[PDB]
Amino acid sequence: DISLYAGSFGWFFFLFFLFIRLLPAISIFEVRDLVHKTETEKALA
Amino acid sequence: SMYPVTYIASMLILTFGGGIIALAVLKSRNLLPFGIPVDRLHDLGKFLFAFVAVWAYVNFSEYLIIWSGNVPELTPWHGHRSAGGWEILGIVMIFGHFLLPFML
Amino acid sequence: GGGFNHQLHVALGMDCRYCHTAVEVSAHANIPPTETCMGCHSQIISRSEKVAFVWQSWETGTSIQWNKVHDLPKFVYFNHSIHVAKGVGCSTCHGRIDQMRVVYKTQPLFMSWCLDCHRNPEKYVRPREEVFNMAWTPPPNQLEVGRRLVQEYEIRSSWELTNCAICHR
Amino acid sequence: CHLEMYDQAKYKPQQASEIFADGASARPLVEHTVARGRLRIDATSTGRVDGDPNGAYVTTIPIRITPELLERGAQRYRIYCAVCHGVNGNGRGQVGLLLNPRPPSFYDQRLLDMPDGEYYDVLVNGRRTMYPYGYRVQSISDRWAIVAHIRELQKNP
Amino acid sequence: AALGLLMYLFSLAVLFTVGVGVWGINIPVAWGFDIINFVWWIGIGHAGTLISAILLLFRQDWRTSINRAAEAMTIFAVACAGIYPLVHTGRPWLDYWMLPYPGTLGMWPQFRSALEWDVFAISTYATVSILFWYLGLIPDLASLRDRATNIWVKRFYGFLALGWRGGARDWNRYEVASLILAGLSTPLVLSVHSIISLDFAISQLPGWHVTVFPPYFVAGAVYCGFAMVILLLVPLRRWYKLHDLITIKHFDLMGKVMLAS
């Protein structure tokens, strides 16, 4: 019961470290819109 | 449990429903100091819709638990409220309260 | 070796309870012992190699290792003799065994088959006097006759007949 | 696919065994044991006067002769006994033309002066070249019904 | 994590071979670490979709950089979770019997048990987590494709992203399929960890048959779940230099929602 639970964090961080390396950890196109939203509110001044 | 929570999810229906009714009579009589943004009325309609669905999730899961394990200290409420004409108001609460304001 | 040939033996006028006795008494249909098969083959085709396997199982004491073709799993608990007593003939569960040189499965012994026949027995129930008649074909008027036989044989409803204490003990 | 309880750790009515000299889990009974439902000592259960081993061949059937027992024995004659003794009891079955000691025809004087309990005794234990029945019939109400049929089948020559 | 996965795959290869009774579950308490960790792991991925879906209803912009580290954190807290309803059964090779398929048995699942709805919740939760995180990665892996300058890693992100191009006729169709998905994953996760809450509250047990289990479990799912996003993103600023995207106001607001949960 311990080795399946403590082993379950392996399968979490096997896939999480596969997610960090192969895929972006931050949605680039949405934070590009957040950079665009900060610029379009500074240009409203 | 959950019996005050079913009121709490309906305190949100009444005062977002009262949010739109009060900004209607104050709009129809031309008494609002601001014109209503059409984007932020879709916010008040998002809140009215997402609290009809919360209300029908806390009232039905209050019923789903009581109906499933029919303990005789929990079933007398929904047994008095689904028999002798109160069955009609039960079917209203699924269709006229949730499913008719779920689709529209 | 030189196994049982049903097509010759039912053609000898054997009425299907000669061997397989207690198909109207027991929960399990008998396969006949060597004493049945040596009742004729002690002098019918004695000193043959087709029935040398039944002479060797008589001079010695080893039971004949017949191969079961209808191997229902042991969680089913089929009950014979409730079907021949509530009017289900040996066809529509076993095929034309009298026209069978070596017995194969006819039905795959599913669960959905035998549930359609427990939920609606009227499309398969025949009279008890034609249960051991293999040439009985279902009539064009199977319904209103099978429904007549269900209320005559007091055959229980689809609710009581499919609830896994029938099967599955 | 998964076979977990498909074949179990118990023995069915006629399945094989890995324990005995014969392959059967169906084991023979000890020869002088009596079960609870089957005392088998009367003049009904044997075809003799008081159930003696060398008894005296009871001359009529002890159990009753009803029309639904004559009709049952007519059915039970056609299953077991009419294969090589003929349907009408003439010894003219399809196998009876091929048995070397030809099955004696009923209607013969000997089989008529034969006592009725000997007709039971040839059933349940067998004659010389006729192997025993009675493990095929397995009920006293149908062994006597068979010889109730033959005694009525011995009236229509 | 490989030594944790070889502790995972060995504890499962033990579990199938010798049985479900190497765990220590008794007959009074017959649900143990197989279910305490299952509701825990299902509970972790739920605030990974409050960040991904519920906050996208609120048009909030602080959910933006916490998005993929919560969409993917949902999926791997479901793939770690969803094995547990498949392996706590004593005969795990028949968990397809909890699916409504036609067979040569006339048998179907029950659809009154709240473990049959756990099949229906998670196999809807596992597939729309990997459909709302893959839809989010359709316009993003088109940017990793154009920044590759190496054709065997460009073809990898040029096939994961199906060919996206941007485009207002595709950007308008994206967000009306994103906020509807963010509007479909918001009653889902208030229902999933309510359906992983009904499989105690359906039962007549004294500590289990309480009727505030459905909103209090999902409150604890967006309590334990925000704790895992905080436990994972504090070591994703100090190790990957994301101090200018995961700025501390994102933790001031993830702490307020964890407090409000």
Next chain:
Amino acid sequence: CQFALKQPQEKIVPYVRQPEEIIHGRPLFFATAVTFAGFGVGLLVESHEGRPTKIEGNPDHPASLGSTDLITQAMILTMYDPDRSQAPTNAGQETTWDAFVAAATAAMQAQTAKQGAGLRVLSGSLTSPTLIAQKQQLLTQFPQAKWYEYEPVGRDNANAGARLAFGADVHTIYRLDTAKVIVGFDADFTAPSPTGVRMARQLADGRRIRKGTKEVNRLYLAESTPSITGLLADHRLPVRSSQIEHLVRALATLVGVPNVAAGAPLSDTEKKWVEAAAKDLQANRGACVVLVGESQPPVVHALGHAINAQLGNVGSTVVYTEPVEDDPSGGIAALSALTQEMNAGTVEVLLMIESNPVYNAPADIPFAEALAKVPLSMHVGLYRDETAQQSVWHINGAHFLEAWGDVRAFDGTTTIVQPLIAPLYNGKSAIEVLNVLLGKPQETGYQTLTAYWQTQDASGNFRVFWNTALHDGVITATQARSRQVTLQQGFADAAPPAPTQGLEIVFRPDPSLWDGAFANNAWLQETPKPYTKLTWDNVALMSVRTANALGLKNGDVVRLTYQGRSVDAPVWVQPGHADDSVTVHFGFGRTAAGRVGNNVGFNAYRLRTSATPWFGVGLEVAKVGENYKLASTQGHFLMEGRKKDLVRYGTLAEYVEDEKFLQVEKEEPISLIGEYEYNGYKWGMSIDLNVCNSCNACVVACQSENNIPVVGKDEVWLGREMHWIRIDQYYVGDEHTPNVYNMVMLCQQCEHAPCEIVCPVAATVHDAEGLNNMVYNRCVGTKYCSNNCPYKVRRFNFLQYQDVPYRSPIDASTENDSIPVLKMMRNPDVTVRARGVMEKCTFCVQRINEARIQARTENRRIADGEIMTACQQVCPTQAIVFGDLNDPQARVVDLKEQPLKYTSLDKLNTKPRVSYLAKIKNLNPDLAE
């Protein structure tokens, strides 16, 4: 994990000569009996083709009136034990049987040269008339040969008390159907004794409490340890087991006995008990009885016949017959007279019929060193016992289902032990081994059995007489003739010594394993012990006040140092116990039992001293351990305020004023699920909790009928016992003198079953008959049904529980491979379940269906007695009553409209089919304060 696309080619084999009696699929019950101590219990065992699979009670028999004991029921796993001796053994290595008859007959011609001097036999207390006639043929062929009869739970003090009061030896058959009060004295008579099933029915027949019942039994007990009669006792008294000789001397002087010579005074709660038990004995003189068990010395046994002859019970409820056993004046003193003869030679042949005296002897009787002085030691037993290694020769046993034999029960009624099966391993029973010693080695067991009864039948037509004796079981042309007695005076004149201060030891037989003869039986081991629900452990039973003086908890291992020997015993404290009166149980510590009973507990036989063989006061506890395993199966022995839901207990003083005083006249509960219409064969059960003595015969008969697997000691401690029915002690009251109440908790077959609605694959549904169908092939193993079952009567197969005392269940090397000889003990109508499916008491649905389907073929309906479940067909008190609820003239429809009909957990609306008749424990007015 077995896996294949197809099941393999299943072979179906017929016979080669099918016998007439056998129909494949029909049960074919045979009437035999079992020699338990020396007496017959009387059996009706179910042999499907040849193999007996289920022992039931012979309802014609006087001992069992259709219901067996705990030990008598589990003689099937003893029969199909793979640890049985499969071959004879000569000096360690295996051999043949005819090598023995060439070695024994070569030693029998050397004994006829003498006057048969060295031909000692050590059988155990046999009563069977064929072995008596073979002994009396053996002792007239060899003149100086001696037949010693050792039995560790023999009636040694019970027959020495019959000599000390009456002169010659007399058998004492008690009769409790005409008995208002039953003042026992250390007498667990409802135990597995030779008369334990009849004395439990006759005691429970008196207290069947109905709508118009005002007088029931009383049952004053005064027991040393909590014994299973104490569940039926209404005034059980925890006496120190050394004062029971002084409670009877205080009760024989209240009644008229002239020369009682009372001494060693009593406490304030033992004296007000005995002034009220004897006050209820001076009244109702014609129907009252004073009982005393063999734990007591022979003087109080003689006083127990003195009181029963004073009160006029002789001829009324205490009948005196000729002794049914052959040698009543031979016991432990007969074993001690043999080893002092076995020393320094002067013994040449030692036959040992099944006694196991290497293991069973007292410590003062050196049977180990006296053995291996005999040049030819032969042993006859169905196990290679502790003796069979230390014997020169060894034979198989021929367990009673394999051997032609006789046995005489009490009342003298002889019953013929037919073999239901041929001997699997060639058994050569005790009647067949004396045939070798007499000189008839080719004579079979049947040829010497009918040779005796042809000469003991003074009527004509023996074949009618013999076939009827095999059919009915009983003979009853052979009952023990009633003996006119004297009750000589001047036997208790000598005053007893001082009651010695010090902590007392108390020797007991375990109700599961009686004397270790069946310690290799897996069904008896995992069956929970009656008060202390333990499975695989001998314990030292202490009171709560005794362990508080010694400072030891419920699991410490202590080294119980008696007069010269230490035993290294674990501790289970026990509320009903007497003060300073540590009780150890027999049946454990066997070093050569097999794979079940090897090293399970501590051998209590190393503390017997043959002068204090049941109780002595020189014990030193001296704790030497901590935290033993002690795999118990109850969890909480204390009713936690859950009264009105577990065992509603009242007295008869408040029941004669209010009938439904334990019922709660409440409003009908509201259910949102509606209800279903059960109109044909509504199956319900009524468990009379007032008459259940926690005999555990219904636990082990559900095990033998429903193929329930045994679970080892390591997985009982994890609470994974497989028991479809369980008995629940509850210990209401003061922690030193409590009332112990049984709840027979099985699957209540709830109509609104909460265990069914939580099954994802619908592997638990209802019949239209109404009972709960747990289908095993559909169970995927999600243990949610067990969680929603409020009674927790669901039992999950966790590992592959199959043949677990023969292979430890934590491997898959033999998961789908099974022992071949254990497959024959299984019922062919119950699924032998896989690794991950859940079990449940199915009302014995294989017994429901086999008579429901049989009643459909013959177009009738089921009657009441046509379906009798395994827990119902075994209960000696008939506490369990199963039957149709829609049949208006049924037996369970009367028992479920009684004023004591309560269902367990009616706070939940499960609507059970199992209702319980409440407990009424008949308290005296002079003792209830």
